[PDB]
Every structure is written in structure tokens, then in C-alpha cells.
Amino acid sequence: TVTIYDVAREARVSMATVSRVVNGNQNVKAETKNKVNEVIKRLNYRPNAKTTTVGVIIPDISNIYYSQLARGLEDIATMYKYHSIISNSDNDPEKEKEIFNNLLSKQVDGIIFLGGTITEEMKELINQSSVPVVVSGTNGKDAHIASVNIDFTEAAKEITGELIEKGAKSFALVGGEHSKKAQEDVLEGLTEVLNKNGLQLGDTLNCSGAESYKEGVKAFAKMKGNLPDAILCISDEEAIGIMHSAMDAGIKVPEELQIISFNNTRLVEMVRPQLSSVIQPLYDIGAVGMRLLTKYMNDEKIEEPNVVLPHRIEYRGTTK
Amino acid sequence: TVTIYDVAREARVSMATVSRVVNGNQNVKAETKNKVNEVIKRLNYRPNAKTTTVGVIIPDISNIYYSQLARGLEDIATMYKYHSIISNSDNDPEKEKEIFNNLLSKQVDGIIFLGGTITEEMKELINQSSVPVVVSGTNGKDAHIASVNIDFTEAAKEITGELIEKGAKSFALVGGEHSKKAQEDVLEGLTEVLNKNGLQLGDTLNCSGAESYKEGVKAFAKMKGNLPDAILCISDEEAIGIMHSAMDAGIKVPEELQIISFNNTRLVEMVRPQLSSVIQPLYDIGAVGMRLLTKYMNDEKIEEPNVVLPHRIEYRGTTK
């Protein structure tokens, strides 16, 4: 299918600029607006279709990937003329239950979970409620809930193969407790390709709170001794922490060490070496989510309630 | 007064680690918890004191400074055992009115505005409502509303003096429409010190949406011809965009060009050259805010409802 990155790459603009054209920003240059509306019509990019309030539950609002996804959701909800309210759960099962029940008591019309884990108790509150629920990047007891994601397992198989071709033989995976679906699905793909070739998997570092730059400095500390050839990280901030820590300690990136991320954000280009990463269609993750949510809220049937969006891998500087 | 940075600098940890100790995170190392609780007691750091929901209105959730401030507010609100919900306004006066009225209809017990502008019409909705309101980094018709801020004008006078001592004679100021108080208060301080010494002020670049890295690439494009000696930027992401654009074009930072930010975030240390910036007590901005809000919600009088928090300036790499 067609994504915001396809329109952007073709039009030579950022996915953010495309989103501004789609959202009707009146400050976008009139000429670039035309250069974008042209690709949009040729590729036929169409992300979007009572007082209404959408509640969004994310583990960590300071997570740059999740705050981007959430702003996009808020842009899209204004297109639909919906109000929206965001709450911060820390993937704490008790906070999650308290949030859900708060949103229900405030009579939201739909809820979206970005990241985190649906406990079996949480699955009960969802099943028992009339408020429809769409999820993304969540794990746990989330079956038979409408969803949208990229295929992390496939992205990690693709990525792991390339590294082996470039000669990597030692591999490590770093992640955290906010993006657990990504960590698990990447480990699945990574270990399948490592086992295929009989290659070594090192420690799997799983941090407790924010998947931050400082958690990556501490992840580099934990492996400074027996560094692996390549490190796959879910958070791109965390990867930036491993990159800088290693380069400060003299390690050559990408010659001696290769780093790749999965949860892409604008930070990928704000750093030197630039970060090799999977590029997910962030705006479309929110567009599909609101489409799906809107159908439920309009008591319509949904043909395919579990959408898998395409991904791209831009190797750019932390890979050899 | 004492801030989170004072405890952190003394304990040799990050303000974030201190916040985790204060917030009762059970994953913080038991020894560091002691090293922090010691400074906390000596300096006597005490940031914090019906079902309750606090609504927070921010211009842009993807703004890293605002998302940090907002997570902190959410941590603090859990300490108080409050629910909280965040909404994204884009400093759009119509969105702001629609948000405010949405939060009131959902019967929130208090509202906090981070950044943005209080229009005269918005000031009416606030005056007419029984829901108390605290603001921070907002401008416009916000008089007689309780507030907490650092003194941007003073920070900009201090900073402008140092640059002149280091030989800067040409100065520019970049900002945007989300953080307008900061831009105006910094311009005030900057121009007062420039006029004192008869120094030149260049164009004041004011962007339309996110104060992002890409707006800084475009700000560098707009001045690539007649670059000034020093550029003051409100957003540290935007400053990172000017820094990388200039270094890619060969300009030496800090030798030929000096850059300084005002709205500090974790991004200051994730980049090389490291960003010279004003360090604001982010956790305390939210702690004072919730303290102030809580007093109103408990129908208590407030001795000093307009709090000015101390600031620090860490010159580190983009300054000579």
C-alpha cells in the first residue's frame, strides 16, 4: 500500500510537510503544496475519511516516537472534528486500569492504546465496555482487538541478514518495558536468523522506565567489556546513547560497531553518524487507527480489523 | 531557592534520577537512592505536598521540552493521586477555546496551560469558570492568573553579556509561535544589552508550527548569506538544526558561530558539539504548578501566586 513516506520521497519533502498539506495548514508554501498534492493524487494517498472525544493511552509522553505518534493522532482527530485527551501510563498495570476507568467515567467515545501491555484484567474492562478500542504496538492479552502495526519480526529478519552479509557474528538486543511488542517481535526475527546461521546472541538488556539516551549509556557500560559486532535497539534515543558512549570510548562506528533502531523519530537525522533505522509510516499508523476507531464508533463493520502497514529500512551511517 | 538541579549536581546524578527517587520508583539503585535522599534532606528539597482530574493544555506534544514538562506534571499528579489528561492546541486560539470547553464539560477540577497565548476571549472563559487555572510559559492576557516561570529576560541579559565579552557583535534571535513568552522576554533582555553597547540586531525569525530541527535548517538557510556572530534560539532542537546546517556548510562552531538555547531538554547532551543552554528546573516548574493548583482546588489562599524559579546557564561547546 501507499504511505506518507512514499509521497514524501517522491515529492522530495518530509513526511511532516506532507502531513501539513493533508491537514490543511495554511502556512505551507503554495508551490510545495502543489508539488505534494500532485503525488498525492497520482499515488492516490487518502489517509483520512454528536460531540466526540478520543482518549489515547501511551506509556511515556516524553518518548519521542510515542509523542510524535500522539500528535499525529491529534492532528487527525481535528480533521474528524474530534476532541482528544492523552494519558501517561508507564506500562504500570494499575495506572493503566485507573486511566481506562477515568476515561470511561469521563465518557470518551473511543480509546487508543499506543505501546504497553494489555493485562488479562485489562482485557476484561475492554470486553465489558461499550467504548471501542484500537491498539498499536501493544502486547499481552490483546487478541480480537483492532490493531495497526508494521511487521517487526520481518523488519528484524531483513536487518539481521544484512548485518551478517557485512560480517557481523555477535549480536545483542536492547529494549525496555514500554515497547514490549517491538522487543519481543524483533527478538523473534533476530533469533530465527541467528539460529539459522549458528551465530551468537548476547545478553538482552531490558530497562525499566523511559527507553532513553541515558539507558543507552548504561547499556554501553554493561557491554563495554565484551562488545558484540552489532546491537539492535528499539528506541532510537537509546541507540544514540550507545553510539555516543562507544565513540567517546574510542570505538569506531560503523567499522568496529554497528547500531540499528526500529522505532524511528526525527532524532535519526539530528545526529552524526546518522542513525540506520527502520522507517515506520507514523502518520498512517495514526490514520489507520482513527479510520478503524471511527468505523466502530459509527457502528459499522470492519473488513480487516488488524492492519499491518509496510515499512522501509534506511541504512545511513551506523551500519557499514 | 533549592531546585532539582541543585540536588542532582550535588549528588552527581541527573535531575531525572532525582525525580525517580522523589516519585518512589522501586527500580532506582538502592545505593543511589541513599546518595540522593541525603542531599534531599540536607538541602531540604520538598517539591510536593474526591476523585480529581487535572487537564493540561500544551501547544505541541512532540515538542521535547513540553512533553518532558508534561510527563513531570503527570508523575507529580500521581503522587497527589490525581488523574490527568493532556490536549494539543498548536497555539490555535480556536483549538484553545474548544479544548478549554471540552475539559470543562468533562468536569476537570483544575487546568494548567504550558506555553501558548491566552487571548482576551480565553481570559473570559477562565474568569467565568469555577475551575482554577495555573499557567507557565504563556503570554497574552494572562495577568492575575497564577504562574511559574524562570526569568527569561534576566537569562538573556546574562547570556548576551557573555557573548559580547567573547567578542560577538552581530546577534540574531530565532523562535516560534508556541513559546511566545520566551521569545518576547528574551528579545527584551537581548535588545536591552545590545542597545547598551550599540551592537547590531539582525532579523528575528519566527516560524509557524513546531519549533523543530527542520525549522533550524530553514533558519540557517535564511541567514547563510549574512551570518551573525551569535544566534540565540528558544528551542534546543531548532538550535541543533542551525548547528548541524552550519557545520555541514563548513562554518566552525563555536569559533566562527556561537549558538545558545533557552528551553533545555535531554537533547542538549545527545549532540556533539554539546549545546550551551539555560537549564530550567523542569520538575520544579511542574511541582510548583501542582502545588499552586492544589491550593486553589482546596479553596486555600495563596501567598505568592506568581512564582519565578531560579535558572542556571551551562556553557558547553556551542559557545567559545
Side-chain angles (χ1 to χ4, degrees):
Chain A
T1 90
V2 53
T3 66
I4 192 130
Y5 58 68
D6 294 321
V7 180
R9 295 302 180 266
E10 191 153 358
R12 302 273 194 97
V13 307
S14 65
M15 294 170 6
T17 290
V18 176
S19 81
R20 274 185 286 254
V21 182
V22 171
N23 294 338
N25 184 16
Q26 276 176 334
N27 281 277
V28 48
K29 311 73 79 182
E31 148 205 356
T32 72
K33 153 170 145 136
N34 302 325
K35 214 197 219 199
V36 174
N37 279 345
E38 217 176 74
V39 187
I40 285 184
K41 174 108 192 263
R42 185 158 75 251
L43 294 193
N44 183 81
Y45 186 60
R46 277 193 20 101
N48 301 315
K50 273 168 47 153
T51 170
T52 303
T53 302
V54 182
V56 184
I57 308 174
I58 62 154
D60 176 31
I61 187 86
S62 72
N63 203 314
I64 289 166
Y65 167 90
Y66 282 108
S67 71
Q68 285 198 208
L69 274 176
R71 184 203 188 180
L73 270 175
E74 286 244 40
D75 294 342
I76 289 149
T78 320
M79 292 306 71
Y80 289 74
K81 290 205 147 183
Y82 308 148
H83 313 292
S84 46
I85 50 178
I86 307 171
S87 288
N88 190 100
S89 83
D90 293 319
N91 204 18
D92 176 60
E94 210 63 41
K95 275 224 230 188
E96 281 180 296
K97 172 200 169 155
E98 263 159 75
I99 287 177
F100 191 76
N101 286 326
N102 189 50
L103 299 180
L104 291 195
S105 85
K106 297 316 195 344
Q107 289 173 328
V108 309
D109 308 286
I111 296 175
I112 297 171
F113 285 81
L114 308 175
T117 308
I118 309 291
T119 70
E120 177 60 53
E121 163 185 23
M122 173 67 63
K123 188 56 170 291
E124 274 341 291
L125 305 172
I126 296 174
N127 280 345
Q128 268 144 26
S129 182
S130 40
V131 176
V133 169
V134 174
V135 296
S136 182
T138 75
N139 68 319
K141 273 315 196 236
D142 64 3
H144 321 303
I145 306 179
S147 87
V148 45
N149 290 278
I150 64 124
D151 187 340
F152 289 92
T153 304
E154 174 185 61
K157 281 150 108 147
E158 299 163 351
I159 276 150
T160 307
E162 186 64 62
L163 294 165
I164 301 169
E165 287 169 347
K166 293 295 190 168
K169 279 162 238 151
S170 358
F171 290 79
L173 170 56
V174 337
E177 95 158 316
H178 296 167
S179 314
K180 266 174 141 123
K181 191 224 189 2
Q183 193 270 327
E184 285 160 2
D185 292 0
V186 162
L187 181 66
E188 178 182 354
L190 162 70
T191 63
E192 176 195 326
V193 179
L194 281 207
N195 288 334
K196 206 143 63 188
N197 304 292
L199 287 194
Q200 200 180 86
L201 171 70
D203 292 358
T204 301
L205 306 185
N206 275 306
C207 66
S208 325
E211 314 197 14
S212 65
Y213 165 95
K214 298 176 190 274
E215 295 296 327
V217 176
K218 290 171 32 180
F220 181 70
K222 281 192 201 169
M223 323 176 214
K224 185 175 180 72
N226 195 27
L227 263 157
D229 291 342
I231 300 171
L232 285 79
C233 325
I234 300 309
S235 163
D236 63 2
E237 318 179 34
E238 206 161 341
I240 284 153
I242 313 200
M243 193 193 40
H244 285 315
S245 305
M247 292 188 309
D248 293 349
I251 319 274
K252 263 302 294 162
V253 172
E255 297 78 346
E256 283 167 290
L257 174 73
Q258 307 180 75
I259 309 127
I260 177 118
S261 30
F262 283 84
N263 277 357
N264 62 306
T265 81
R266 40 200 211 266
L267 251 189
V268 150
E269 74 189 326
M270 303 179 165
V271 284
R272 321 275 161 192
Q274 266 179 173
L275 196 47
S276 314
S277 187
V278 153
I279 314 286
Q280 305 180 26
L282 302 192
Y283 185 79
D284 306 79
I285 297 172
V288 172
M290 195 75 61
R291 272 178 169 282
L292 284 165
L293 190 66
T294 289
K295 283 208 93 91
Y296 288 128
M297 275 183 304
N298 285 332
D299 317 294
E300 319 193 358
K301 187 206 162 75
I302 285 178
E303 60 291 345
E304 186 44 68
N306 293 105
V307 176
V308 173
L309 276 182
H311 60 265
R312 236 163 101 252
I313 319 171
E314 280 179 21
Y315 298 93
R316 27 195 6 181
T318 55
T319 43
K320 93 179 30 178
Chain B
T1 90
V2 53
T3 66
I4 192 130
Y5 58 68
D6 294 321
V7 180
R9 295 302 180 266
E10 191 153 358
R12 302 273 194 97
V13 307
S14 65
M15 294 170 6
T17 290
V18 176
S19 81
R20 274 185 286 254
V21 182
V22 171
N23 294 338
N25 184 16
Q26 276 176 334
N27 281 277
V28 48
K29 311 73 79 182
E31 148 205 356
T32 72
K33 153 170 145 136
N34 302 325
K35 214 197 219 199
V36 174
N37 279 345
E38 217 176 74
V39 187
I40 285 184
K41 174 108 192 263
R42 185 158 75 251
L43 294 193
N44 183 81
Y45 186 60
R46 277 193 20 101
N48 301 315
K50 273 168 47 153
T51 170
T52 303
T53 302
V54 182
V56 184
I57 308 174
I58 62 154
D60 176 31
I61 187 86
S62 72
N63 203 314
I64 289 166
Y65 167 90
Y66 282 108
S67 71
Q68 285 198 208
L69 274 176
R71 184 203 188 180
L73 270 175
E74 286 244 40
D75 294 342
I76 289 149
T78 320
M79 292 306 71
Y80 289 74
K81 290 205 147 183
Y82 308 148
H83 313 292
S84 46
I85 50 178
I86 307 171
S87 288
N88 190 100
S89 83
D90 293 319
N91 204 18
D92 176 60
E94 210 63 41
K95 275 224 230 188
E96 281 180 296
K97 172 200 169 155
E98 263 159 75
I99 287 177
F100 191 76
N101 286 326
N102 189 50
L103 299 180
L104 291 195
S105 85
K106 297 316 195 344
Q107 289 173 328
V108 309
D109 308 286
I111 296 175
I112 297 171
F113 285 81
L114 308 175
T117 308
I118 309 291
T119 70
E120 177 60 53
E121 163 185 23
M122 173 67 63
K123 188 56 170 291
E124 274 341 291
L125 305 172
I126 296 174
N127 280 345
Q128 268 144 26
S129 182
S130 40
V131 176
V133 169
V134 174
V135 296
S136 182
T138 75
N139 68 319
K141 273 315 196 236
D142 64 3
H144 321 303
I145 306 179
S147 87
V148 45
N149 290 278
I150 64 124
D151 187 340
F152 289 92
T153 304
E154 174 185 61
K157 281 150 108 147
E158 299 163 351
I159 276 150
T160 307
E162 186 64 62
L163 294 165
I164 301 169
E165 287 169 347
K166 293 295 190 168
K169 279 162 238 151
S170 358
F171 290 79
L173 170 56
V174 337
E177 95 158 316
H178 296 167
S179 314
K180 266 174 141 123
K181 191 224 189 2
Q183 193 270 327
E184 285 160 2
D185 292 0
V186 162
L187 181 66
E188 178 182 354
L190 162 70
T191 63
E192 176 195 326
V193 179
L194 281 207
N195 288 334
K196 206 143 63 188
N197 304 292
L199 287 194
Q200 200 180 86
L201 171 70
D203 292 358
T204 301
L205 306 185
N206 275 306
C207 66
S208 325
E211 314 197 14
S212 65
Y213 165 95
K214 298 176 190 274
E215 295 296 327
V217 176
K218 290 171 32 180
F220 181 70
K222 281 192 201 169
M223 323 176 214
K224 185 175 180 72
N226 195 27
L227 263 157
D229 291 342
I231 300 171
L232 285 79
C233 325
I234 300 309
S235 163
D236 63 2
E237 318 179 34
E238 206 161 341
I240 284 153
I242 313 200
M243 193 193 40
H244 285 315
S245 305
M247 292 188 309
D248 293 349
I251 319 274
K252 263 302 294 162
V253 172
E255 297 78 346
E256 283 167 290
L257 174 73
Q258 307 180 75
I259 309 127
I260 177 118
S261 30
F262 283 84
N263 277 357
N264 62 306
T265 81
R266 40 200 211 266
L267 251 189
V268 150
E269 74 189 326
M270 303 179 165
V271 284
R272 321 275 161 192
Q274 266 179 173
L275 196 47
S276 314
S277 187
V278 153
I279 314 286
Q280 305 180 26
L282 302 192
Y283 185 79
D284 306 79
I285 297 172
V288 172
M290 195 75 61
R291 272 178 169 282
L292 284 165
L293 190 66
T294 289
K295 283 208 93 91
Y296 288 128
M297 275 183 304
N298 285 332
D299 317 294
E300 319 193 358
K301 187 206 162 75
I302 285 178
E303 60 291 345
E304 186 44 68
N306 293 105
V307 176
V308 173
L309 276 182
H311 60 265
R312 236 163 101 252
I313 319 171
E314 280 179 21
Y315 298 93
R316 27 195 6 181
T318 55
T319 43
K320 93 179 30 178

